[PDB]
Write a protein that binds this ligand. Structure first.
Ligand SMILES: CC(=O)N[C@@H]1[C@@H](O)[C@H](O[C@@H]2O[C@H](CO)[C@@H](O[C@@H]3O[C@H](CO)[C@@H](O[C@@H]4O[C@H](CO)[C@@H](O[C@@H]5O[C@H](CO)[C@@H](O)[C@H](O)[C@H]5NC(C)=O)[C@H](O)[C@H]4NC(C)=O)[C@H](O)[C@H]3NC(C)=O)[C@H](O)[C@H]2NC(C)=O)[C@@H](CO)O[C@H]1O
Length: 496
């Protein structure tokens, strides 16, 4: 089954409002950049972002010029003419609107509180989708808190129902309306709703893991923002998941959540697979189309794992644009972020950057010896490993933030498409390396194994193995006369 290639596409409100396909100083990446060939490399385009207003319904930003919005959306859905499998989805939320301190945060909390608020919010989603011509809904709330999860779950089940009804009413069985969400890609915030992952994923076609931003100015040691696998020399983190209200036993929590651990794309994907009820096919691995820059680093390991003096304030608080050769950083006023389109130009402008490669994490990085700078980003090369990882783990596909940041020839999107579908590309010999793998194992991804059926009346010694309820169980100590699961002495260690 074809791997999803989900491109979020962000156009700030004032760009909609001054939209033009002829002046990059105003709209850097207009829809015209997406040629028929590019439309064919995508399966989904997630227009970003819509919000949840004070009336607790899905709606465009208050300051949006509706005529221009519809014109831009129409330009996107017109791309469907070149690829019959393409879906233009819209995403609700995003960092700016929904974080704990976001401008619309309370609307998200309220929208999901009661059956009526949920019914009202859900219907507003379907109305917006039909009214503008979208093909599905992506919920990007970062992130409901533990108490808000049950309501959030109910709002998703409500949107699924309305959407499924709409697919029937519109004869869209050839391309059903879809529902997806963007999920945390790191243990830290994933722990808010982790215990109820199965219920959260059930109503979705995909869960887009934001497996990027794993590093940033908020961490004392510079690091790759999307390491595929871990590097023993890099930092490690407390496995917050071991504290989730899972109801598991110490042995289960320990085998499932080693701590500390390496914060990697691999860790997030495995953490999701460990949950019963979360099918690999619904998991989509996000990759970033931009890099993160740190200053005040020390040479030695090319800027990696070093202390730094990068401001963490959001937005950036200064006019000191220290990313050498980064024009894009000046107009957007932040030297800490740079689109891959710009990073590429920085590399060919003799600005003093050296491109390095970490064969453990399988990701590139820039180092500027003269000014002490370090940049972590992804490229066509790191995408090879991630694409193979996706195929190997049988994931749903890849997702990226965001289309508007690729170079003009669209090499990043092209590489992704190439690795999944080009008949002249073969990665059977691509060596995935020795970087650290997340070794956790849980209920949803136990090893297949065999054992003598459990025999009632039998006394089992320590470490004994038996089959029961379609699982293989192992005793934790001796003289076990109880049945598996029917006593704290047995550890479920395998399936079938
Ligand atoms: C005080 C302290 O040190 N606490 C830390 C704690 O901060 C650490 O957790 C990390 O927190 C940071 C925020 O402080 C998290 O950074 C988030 O990460 C989000 C993804 O998980 C990210 O949002 C998504 O990613 C896109 C790219 O960043 C977002 O794009 C942005 O959209 C804006 C409009 O909404 C637009 O204005 C911006 O220009 C745009 N940015 C870019 C690069 O284009 C997108 O909105 C969003 N959705 C999707 C689908 O991609 C946030 O942007 C980002 N915030 C900021 C300000 O950068 C980080 O993820 C947390 N880490 C982890 C592992 O969860 C914590 C652990 O490190 O330690 C504490 O001590």
């Amino acid at each position: 089954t074809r791997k999803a290639v989900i491109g979020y596409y962000f156009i700030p409100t004032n760009q909609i409002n001054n939209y033009t396909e002829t002046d990059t100083s105003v709209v850097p990446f207009p829809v015209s950049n997406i040629t028929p060939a590019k439309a064919k490399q995508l399966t989904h385009i997630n227009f970003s972002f819509l919000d949840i207003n004070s009336n607790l319904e899905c709606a465009w930003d208050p300051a949006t010029n509706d005529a221009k919005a519809r014109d831009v959306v129409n330009r996107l859905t017109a791309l469907k003419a070149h690829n019959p499998s393409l879906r233009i989805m819209f995403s609700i939320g995003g960092w700016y609107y929904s974080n704990d301190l976001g401008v619309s945060h309370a609307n998200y909390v309220n929208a999901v509180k009661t059956p009526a608020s949920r019914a009202k919010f859900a219907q507003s989603c379907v109305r917006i989708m039909k009214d503008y011509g979208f093909d599905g809904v992506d919920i990007d709330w970062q992130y409901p808190q533990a108490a808000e999860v049950d309501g959030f779950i109910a709002a998703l089940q409500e949107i699924r129902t309305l959407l499924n009804q709409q697919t029937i009413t519109d004869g869209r069985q050839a391309l059903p309306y879809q529902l997806t969400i963007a999920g945390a890609g790191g243990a830290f915030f994933l722990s808010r709703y982790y215990s109820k992952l199965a219920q959260i994923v059930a109503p979705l076609d995909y869960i887009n893991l934001m497996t990027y931003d794993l590093a940033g100015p908020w961490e004392k040691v510079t690091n790759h923002q999307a390491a595929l696998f871990g590097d023993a020399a890099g930092p490690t983190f407390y496995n917050a998941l071991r504290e989730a209200n899972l109801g598991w036993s110490w042995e289960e929590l320990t085998r499932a959540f080693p701590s500390p651990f390496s914060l990697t794309v691999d860790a997030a994907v495995q953490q999701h697979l460990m949950m019963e009820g979360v099918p690999s096919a619904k998991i989509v691995m996000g990759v970033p189309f931009y890099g993160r820059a740190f200053k005040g680093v020390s040479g030695g390991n090319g800027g990696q794992y070093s202390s730094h003096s990068t401001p963490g304030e959001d937005p950036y608080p200064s006019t000191d644009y220290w990313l050498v050769g980064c024009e894009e950083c000046v107009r957007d006023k932040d030297p800490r972020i740079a689109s891959y389109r710009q990073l590429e130009q920085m590399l060919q402008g003799n600005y003093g950057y050296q491109r390095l490669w970490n064969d453990k994490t399988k990701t590139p990085y820039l180092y500027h010896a003269q000014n002490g700078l370090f940049v972590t980003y992804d490229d066509a090369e790191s995408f090879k490993y991630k694409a193979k990882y996706i195929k190997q783990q049988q994931l749903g596909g890849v997702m990226f933030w965001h289309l508007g940041q690729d170079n003009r020839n669209g090499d990043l999107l092209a590489a992704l498409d190439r690795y999944f579908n080009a008949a002249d590309y073969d990665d059977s010999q691509l060596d995935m390396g020795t970087g650290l793998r997340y070794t956790g194992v849980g209920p949803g991804n136990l090893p297949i194994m065999t054992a003598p059926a459990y025999v009632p009346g039998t006394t089992y010694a320590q470490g004994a193995l038996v089959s029961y309820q379609g699982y293989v169980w192992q005793t934790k100590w001796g003289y076990i006369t109880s049945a598996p699961g029917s006593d704290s002495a047995w550890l479920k260690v395998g399936r079938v």
